[PDB]
Design an enzyme around this catalytic site. Structure first.
Site, PDB file in Angstrom:
ATOM      1  N   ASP A  36      35.302 118.331  38.991  1.00  0.00           N
ATOM      2  CA  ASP A  36      34.382 119.458  38.904  1.00  0.00           C
ATOM      3  C   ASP A  36      35.013 120.789  39.296  1.00  0.00           C
ATOM      4  O   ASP A  36      35.098 121.104  40.489  1.00  0.00           O
ATOM      5  CB  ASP A  36      33.162 119.149  39.780  1.00  0.00           C
ATOM      6  N   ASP A 232      33.991 125.672  33.982  1.00  0.00           N
ATOM      7  CA  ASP A 232      33.361 124.617  34.763  1.00  0.00           C
ATOM      8  C   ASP A 232      33.340 123.272  34.036  1.00  0.00           C
ATOM      9  O   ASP A 232      32.449 122.992  33.218  1.00  0.00           O
ATOM     10  CB  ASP A 232      31.931 125.045  35.141  1.00  0.00           C
TER      11      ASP A 232
HETATM   12  C1  LIG Z   1      30.292 118.276  45.244  1.00  0.00           C
HETATM   13  O1  LIG Z   1      29.722 119.319  46.050  1.00  0.00           O
HETATM   14  C2  LIG Z   1      28.891 120.190  45.442  1.00  0.00           C
HETATM   15  N1  LIG Z   1      28.514 119.983  44.193  1.00  0.00           N
HETATM   16  C3  LIG Z   1      27.842 120.982  43.586  1.00  0.00           C
HETATM   17  N2  LIG Z   1      27.518 120.802  42.274  1.00  0.00           N
HETATM   18  C4  LIG Z   1      26.548 121.590  41.492  1.00  0.00           C
HETATM   19  C5  LIG Z   1      26.316 120.734  40.231  1.00  0.00           C
HETATM   20  C6  LIG Z   1      26.099 121.590  38.993  1.00  0.00           C
HETATM   21  O2  LIG Z   1      24.985 121.978  38.683  1.00  0.00           O
HETATM   22  N3  LIG Z   1      27.211 121.893  38.231  1.00  0.00           N
HETATM   23  C7  LIG Z   1      27.006 122.728  37.034  1.00  0.00           C
HETATM   24  C8  LIG Z   1      28.490 121.595  38.660  1.00  0.00           C
HETATM   25  N4  LIG Z   1      29.493 122.136  38.049  1.00  0.00           N
HETATM   26  N5  LIG Z   1      28.657 120.732  39.675  1.00  0.00           N
HETATM   27  C9  LIG Z   1      27.592 119.835  40.164  1.00  0.00           C
HETATM   28  C10 LIG Z   1      27.420 118.528  39.364  1.00  0.00           C
HETATM   29  C11 LIG Z   1      28.284 118.096  38.317  1.00  0.00           C
HETATM   30  F1  LIG Z   1      29.346 118.866  38.032  1.00  0.00           F
HETATM   31  C12 LIG Z   1      28.122 116.928  37.608  1.00  0.00           C
HETATM   32  C13 LIG Z   1      27.050 116.107  37.921  1.00  0.00           C
HETATM   33  C14 LIG Z   1      26.168 116.439  38.941  1.00  0.00           C
HETATM   34  C15 LIG Z   1      26.370 117.612  39.631  1.00  0.00           C
HETATM   35  F2  LIG Z   1      25.561 117.888  40.672  1.00  0.00           F
HETATM   36  C16 LIG Z   1      27.854 119.527  41.645  1.00  0.00           C
HETATM   37  N6  LIG Z   1      27.515 122.162  44.146  1.00  0.00           N
HETATM   38  C17 LIG Z   1      27.873 122.336  45.431  1.00  0.00           C
HETATM   39  C18 LIG Z   1      27.496 123.642  46.069  1.00  0.00           C
HETATM   40  C19 LIG Z   1      28.571 121.345  46.130  1.00  0.00           C
HETATM   41  F3  LIG Z   1      28.873 121.459  47.434  1.00  0.00           F
END
Ligand SMILES: COc1nc(N2C[C@H]3C(=O)N(C)C(=N)N[C@@]3(c3c(F)cccc3F)C2)nc(C)c1F
Length: 387
Positions: A36, A232
């Site tokens: 990610d 992303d």
């Molecule tokens: C791991 O740790 C954290 N994770 C996230 N995320 C946000 C999510 C998201 O909406 N996108 C657009 C994203 N790029 N990442 C997330 C994600 C995925 F990619 C794939 C599947 C599920 C997900 F939750 C995960 N955010 C904060 C702040 C973290 F600490």
């Protein structure tokens, strides 16, 4: 150069994400981890969940260290809660190193784990600024570089199959490569072109021009980066700011007007199907995004095909797809369907992102994805959004 040990180390697809095998703890506990570039935490399932067939068991790791701190992460599409700690982490098809890294042990979650995705955690590869609970929680890649001689760069080749993969095929199929510490020249064709990383938080870039089949969308370029533009791997679609999405969809509809599609297709909700092998790729336009170059007043463009922005989905023997371009209220997101066209180099050391045509992009006999330049482009700093 050549990083054979890391080539073909990914699995997955744009809709469910691409993941790499990792190990955590002593003895090592193997987990599949989503790659990610849109977050900065390493977070893994650490308690039973109906969608997980394995999880991190801290009590079975002799090298587990409890940081005695919780972490709560609510995001737009879901949420997760966990407990912070550190442990020894490795990437079996990666650099031959083991590092001590922060791990958020997920104890509670809502709409986070995906049934049948085959991953049990997420590797946030972006910068400490957006780490949770705050920027003092060192991200995995920062730990890897600090503790080893691994160069401060990684590169991703995400490979869309161009057709749906069933449950068994997606587990047996190579989804791409994550090259940690280098660039593998077998993964791309032609030249690499670099855009500056505007600021180190998300992998933020600046788009300076947009074309649909060579026709300029002709918007003030600040609209393309309102309020940011990021790369992303964790988002499936190409997401565009509301006004840009409205202008782009009007232009894509006009270019493809020899066939009428229902409103639900353009909203990215409804699938469209054609008889096996008859997808009319040629009626759909190519899309070019021009990015700021490294040289003053210079830009370059990346061009994607409908084979990237039409995401294959199962229905029959028909070939079906969803429109993988959608609206955003948080800026442009160059998601997995865009990354599938290119080999993307996250050159953290030189604060730049490189793009080259991917050796695994899907195309037809008449058109290919492209990365081309240079173009003379003035006042590109004005394309960046402030406040
Ligand atoms: C791991 O740790 C954290 N994770 C996230 N995320 C946000 C999510 C998201 O909406 N996108 C657009 C994203 N790029 N990442 C997330 C994600 C995925 F990619 C794939 C599947 C599920 C997900 F939750 C995960 N955010 C904060 C702040 C973290 F600490």
């Amino acid at each position: 150069g050549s990083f054979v040990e890391m080539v073909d180390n990914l699995r997955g697809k744009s809709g469910q994400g691409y993941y790499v095998e990792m190990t955590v703890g002593s003895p090592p506990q193997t987990l599949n981890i989503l790659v990610d570039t849109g977050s900065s935490n390493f977070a893994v399932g650490a308690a039973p969940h109906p969608f997980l067939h394995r999880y991190y068991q801290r009590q079975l790791s002799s090298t587990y260290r409890d940081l005695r701190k919780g972490v709560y992460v609510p995001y737009t599409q879901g949420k997760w809660e966990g407990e912070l700690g550190t442990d020894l982490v490795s990437i079996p098809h990666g650099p031959n190193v083991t590092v001590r890294a922060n791990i958020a042990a997920i104890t509670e979650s809502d709409k986070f784990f995906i049934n049948g995705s085959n991953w049990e955690g997420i590797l946030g590869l972006a910068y400490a600024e957006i780490a949770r609970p705050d920027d003092s929680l060192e991200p995995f890649f920062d730990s890897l570089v600090k503790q080893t001689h691994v160069p401060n760069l990684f590169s991703l080749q995400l490979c869309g199959a161009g057709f749906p993969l069933n449950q068994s095929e997606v587990l047996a199929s190579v989804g791409g490569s994550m090259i940690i510490g280098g660039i593998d020249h077998s993964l791309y064709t032609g030249s690499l072109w670099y855009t500056p990383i505007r600021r180190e938080w998300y992998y933020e870039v600046i788009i300076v021009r947009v074309e649909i089949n060579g026709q300029d969308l002709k918007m003030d370029c600040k609209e393309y980066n309102y309020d940011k533009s990021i790369v992303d791997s964790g988002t499936t679609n190409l997401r565009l700011p509301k006004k840009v999405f409205e202008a782009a969809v009007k232009s894509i509809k006009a270019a493809s007007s020899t066939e009428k599609f229902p409103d639900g297709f353009w909203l990215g909700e409804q699938l469209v199907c054609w008889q096996a092998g008859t997808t009319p790729w040629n009626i759909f336009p190519v899309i070019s995004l021009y990015l700021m170059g490294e040289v003053t007043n210079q830009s370059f463009r990346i061009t994607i095909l409908p084979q990237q922005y039409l995401r294959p989905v199962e229905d029959s023997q028909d070939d079906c797809y969803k429109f993988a371009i959608s609206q955003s209220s948080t800026g442009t997101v160059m998601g997995a369907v865009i990354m599938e066209g290119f080999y993307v180099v996250f050159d953290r050391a030189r604060k730049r992102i490189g793009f080259a045509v991917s050796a695994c992009h899907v195309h037809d006999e008449f058109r290919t994805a492209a990365v081309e330049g240079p173009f003379v482009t003035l006042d590109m700093e004005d394309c960046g959004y402030n406040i």
